[PDB]
Amino acid sequence: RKKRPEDFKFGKILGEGSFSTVVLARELATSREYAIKILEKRHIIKENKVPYVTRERDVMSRLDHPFFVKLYFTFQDDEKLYFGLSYAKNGELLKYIRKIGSFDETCTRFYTAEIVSALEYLHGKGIIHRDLKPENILLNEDMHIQITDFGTAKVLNSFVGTAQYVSPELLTEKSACKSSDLWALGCIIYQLVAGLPPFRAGNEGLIFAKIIKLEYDFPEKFFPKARDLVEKLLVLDATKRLGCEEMEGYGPLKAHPFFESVTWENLHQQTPPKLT
C-alpha cells in the first residue's frame, strides 16, 4: 500500500541540498525511523529533472546491500516527491577525516575494505557511481559506511564528478566507466592516510592539470602497502587499474596485500575500529 505524508511524524531537518530537504521521520504504524528526502515538484520541472529523478529512484531501488543507503519507498502529493531512505545517524565520512585529521592504518584498512566491497556490488550490477567521495559515504549508527547520492550515477557518458576525485578519462573523453570509481577510490584511500586528497590546487582548472599529468606526491609517513595499492589505482590507463574488468575484477583487488587480514564475508558484521 502506497505511503502518505500523514503516515509519518517528521522531526529534525537532517540536511538540505540545492533542490531538496531531508528530514528524520518516524513511521507511526511501525515506529521505524527514516531519513525522508523531500523534493519540490515545481523546482524539478523548472530544470527538466523528471527523468533524472526517476533514474535516481530506479538506481537506488536496485541496491540491496548493507553498504548502500536503502530506498524503502517513494510517494508524492500535490507539491512534493518523497524518498524513504535508511537513516545514517553519524553523517559523512568527510566529517571524521576533518575531525581526526587522518586515519591510522587499521581504520584505513577497514573503511577502504568496506568501500571496495561496496564497489564490487555496485559494479557487479553494472552501475557506475561517477561521484564517489567522502561527502557521499555516510556512516550509520554502528559506524559502517552507507554510500548515497545516486542522481549522477550511470547504468550501462555525461559530464559529472567532483574536481578532486574526477578520473582523467572524464576530462579527456567525456566517457566514464566502472574503472572511474576505482580512480576515486584511489583518491579516497590517499585522503584517509594523508589527510588531504592527492590532486590539490588553487582552482578547478589546475587540479584538472595535475590529474592528466598524474602530478602528485606521497608523504614519507604513508603506509607502504597503502601506497602500493594507491599506485595501482591512480593509473592513467583505465584498463590498468586494479579491480577493473580488464584485470579480471575484484578478486585481484581484494587479494592485494593491504587487505591481507581482512575477512570479506562478515565485514559488515564486524565492529569497526574506533576513530581516534
Binding site: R1, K2, K3, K41, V50, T54, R57, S61, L71, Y72, F73, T74, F75, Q76, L81
Partner: peptide, 8 residues
C-alpha cells in the same frame, strides 16, 4: 508524476 509511488 505518473507511477512514481513505490514500496519494498
Amino acid at each position: 508524476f505518473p507511477q512514481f509511488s513505490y514500496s519494498a
